[PDB]
Point group: C3
Chain length 269, copies 3
């Protein structure tokens, strides 16, 4: 694949949060989406603009201990400090012994591993997480990608009973990245939409046995994703997504997948 | 792909519980099993006979906003009032864009969405849940079908140390639907039997790499099913099924898959 | 495969209020010894309960009659100082007379006591009466070494917290992990620098295998999965943290090291 270079900033935010950003003062929670094709290399010029030690750890991708982002492998960043982390990816292939080497492709995530504790409980709690997508050659690309993060009892570190809305048009091919962090198990559910419990979130073809689901138990540091055709077989509407743990939904871990008709209207909303 | 109509009533029961039934005063917990072939449409003539608002939301199957069963999409039911709910299904096909549309086939469930709160915490707690099986052309059909719901710390809203038993004979193709509800994660286990972590609960053949398990972690609104040849390779016996979370089995989330010999006997148990 | 095997196995109290399975009197370990079988194999376990309380042997996944359930229910537990021969059987997958595919015994399985403390072995599990079982399919690739990580309540292999076990391998070694969970709590098992397949073997079969590829897996009491990695594949030598990813679990010390060595013997940054 291609070699690529980006800048990443860890920053303090209002209400004592902590974001990553591609640009200083544009830090988000979750952090910016990172999109890669199998075989790509990413060199990340990472600057800690905070008064506390921070790091960048990644799930699933290839990295050397020198890019672990852990005090253990001395890969964290002093306050004000800079470090360039290297993530590599590979494509699948038979090894020489006959066995199949799984590719790097999947729905993954990066997070701090040193804020609060040597496991980044503080960083994670404050908002130092975001999505990685590693694509395979042939994978179908979406019209948009939306990142939903169950962080303890919040979605994307928002004040509860205010979970984020996502706008789309019927027939649009919408991608969701679903990441979980903190202490608690959850179940992610979506009204009017289904996906496949497999790498991609859609069945490869008729030979794919993967269960089809609208509900998934997820624990801290689990990542999955899936694409749907917005409105497929159900029409336009305010389509609720929510944590299906009853106390979680009642305390307001809910948002709307707002699927507009072609004309721009929405039924009874 | 045939169109169908059935009547469903929400009723308050004895001991302050709530349940769906196919007739008046015949409501069960779980609710009655709904079985569909892909393509089939089901129109549900639903009546809320209770003194509180109630609804019917479904997982997995195709419905419009007007069958969401939510406060949001004004698709819940006043006390005593009626509403006709529509669930469509679809077979798997090729989309124009060359991708594979998945198909509605799978182990699913229906549950109230307004009784307790705007997510029916109260309805679910009181027993407003039931199983839906959507079948695909060629799916092997069972000799019998037994629904097991881990709702909070009970099975099928029974008293504890009292979880249901299911009788069967050696060789029976027995189907289980396993639904989870409320606040707590669980692990469903079964002695003497195992299944595949996939759609049908059966391996398609030797090119099915899916994990063969007898123990599966589940949380609120998770649905799976499977089919076993009763007592396959293990013989007749009282075959325990139990939540494997230790305090959960200890407090009485246990039941018996009672697998009789052909002559109707069973080896001695307690 | 297709061989009859015989072993002896003891239950024993240990130091610090613990109980262990062992191949010999006084050599009990926590976890108990790894039992490795090929599909078709029958294992006869000459079990002796050296302890002062009723203990059993119950196994997940494998084939056993109720006379080897090791339950109160089926009266197959063992009196203090008693001996009982448990029989585990295993079958290869095969086409059934109903045209369906019979799932094989092969996978990542476990054995635990069912009668110490409660009729669900709560006390026996807590105190260390658990061990791993692997059943191999014909032509399964065999590892260079096998390592067992049990998440029992808040600990690993009933060790004192902040001191989880380390495993040593050289870059290029085929390293197998058995990953069992017991007790009351859900966990997520994670490993730095390595990935596996959510499927029977923890390895994709080929390009036809849609299994999700994961470094993080939610597990609950009595969940068992396993996988094999090439040590340092595409990441190189190093101290490769494995940890529960439940933040307070990792904080309270549920961590260990996959110590992957360069070929010369060294570890960068040690
Ligand atoms: Cu880590
Ligand atoms: Cu939640
Ligand atoms: Cu992590
Ligand atoms: Cu629901
Ligand atoms: Cu809902
Ligand atoms: Cu339970
Ligand atoms: Cu009796
Ligand atoms: Cu049991
Ligand atoms: Cu844990
Ligand atoms: Cu067990």
């Amino acid at each position: 694949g291609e070699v690529r270079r980006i800048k990443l900033y860890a920053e303090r935010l209002a209400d004592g949060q902590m974001g990553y950003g591609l640009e200083k003062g544009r830090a988000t929670i979750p952090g910016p989406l990172i999109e890669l094709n199998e075989g790509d290399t990413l060199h990340i010029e990472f600057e800690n603009t905070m008064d506390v030690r921070a790091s960048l750890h990644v799930h699933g991708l290839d990295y050397e201990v020198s890019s672990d982002g852990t005090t253990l492998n001395k890969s964290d960043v002093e306050p004000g400090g800079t470090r360039t982390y290297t993530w590599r990816t590979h494509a699948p292939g038979r090894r020489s012994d006959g066995t199949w080497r799984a590719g790097s492709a999947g729905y993954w995530h990066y997070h701090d591993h040193v804020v609060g504790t040597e496991h980044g409980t503080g960083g994670i709690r404050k908002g130092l997480y975001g999505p990685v997508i590693v694509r395979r050659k042939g994978d179908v690309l979406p019209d948009a990608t939306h990142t939903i993060v169950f962080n303890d009892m919040l979605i994307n570190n928002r004040p509860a009973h205010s979970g984020p809305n996502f706008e789309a048009t019927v027939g649009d091919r919408v991608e969701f990245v679903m990441i979980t962090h903190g202490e608690y198990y959850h179940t992610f559910h979506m009204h009017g939409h289904r996906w496949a419990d497999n790498r991609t979130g859609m069945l490869t073809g008729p030979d794919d046995p993967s269960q089809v689901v609208d509900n998934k138990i997820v624990g801290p540091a689990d990542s999955f994703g899936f694409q749907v055709i917005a409105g497929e077989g159900v029409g336009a509407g305010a389509w609720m997504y929510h944590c299906h743990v009853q106390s979680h939904s009642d305390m307001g871990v809910v948002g709307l997948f707002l699927v507009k008709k072609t004309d721009g209207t929405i039924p009874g909303y």
